[PDB]
């Protein structure tokens, strides 16, 4: 059945190449989504931000801070900001709605 097997192997390559195109096409679509989401992370920072003072970091991705109002809040630190800057109380911009460390 060598003649039949030649057709069977040929079919396997044809199916694989047909599928191979799909992965690249979806991957390109994912690249566009990554850029759009990255812009959204930049967007939260741009809106007017209430001034705040860092107080303590309970854990990575979270912090305890006192704003100009002074009320202490369990805010979430943004991933992009360098962690070393966060440790000194210094001053941290807070998103008005989130209160997060923008």
């Amino acid at each position: 059945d060598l003649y039949s097997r030649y057709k069977k192997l040929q079919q396997e390559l044809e199916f694989l190449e047909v599928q191979e195109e799909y992965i690249k096409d979806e991957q390109k679509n994912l690249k566009k989504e990554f850029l759009h989401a990255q812009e959204e992370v930049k967007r939260i920072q741009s809106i007017p931000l209430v001034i705040g003072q860092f107080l303590e970091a309970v854990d990575q991705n979270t912090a305890i801070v006192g704003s100009t109002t002074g009320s202490n809040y369990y805010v979430r630190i943004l991933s992009t900001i360098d962690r070393e800057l966060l440790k000194p109380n210094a001053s941290v911009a807070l998103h008005k709605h989130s209160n997060a460390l923008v």
Binding site: L16, E20, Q27, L30, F34, I64, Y73, R76
Partner: protein, 130 residues
């Protein structure tokens, strides 16, 4: 040989599946980075207030003073036991229902700077003289 060696040529084309695995890994890798941005939708949620527990009572009720306001009785969350709550502990009160979201440490006044444990002084036991 024409129909028994041409099938062998299709075996050469089998290596494209190995390339498909490499691209499949990239599809997952891109998915992971975008999923991290989907995780960043969490940053939108409002932060819970930070308050100190004056004392605890039974039936999942704790007396916690808000930092700029007044005493509030709060319902403890399932994650933290009433036993875990203690007097003079800086818990987090939920933004809407004032619930006990979590227990936060570092409940200490300016004296923390005085600790001076960090940046331990240069080793000098050998440098000391007689």
């Amino acid at each position: 040989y024409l129909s028994k060696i041409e099938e062998l040529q299709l075996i050469v084309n089998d290596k494209s599946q190995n390339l498909r695995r490499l691209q499949a890994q990239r599809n997952e890798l891109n998915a992971k980075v975008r999923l991290l941005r989907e995780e960043l939708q969490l940053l939108q949620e409002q932060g819970s207030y930070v308050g100190e527990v004056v004392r605890a009572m039974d039936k999942k009720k704790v007396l916690v003073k808000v930092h700029p306001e007044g005493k509030f009785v709060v319902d403890v969350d399932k994650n933290i036991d009433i036993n875990d709550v203690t007097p003079n502990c800086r818990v987090a009160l939920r933004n809407d229902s004032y619930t006990l979201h979590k227990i936060l440490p570092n409940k200490v006044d300016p004296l923390v700077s005085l600790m001076m444990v960090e940046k331990v002084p240069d080793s000098t036991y050998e440098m000391i003289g007689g």
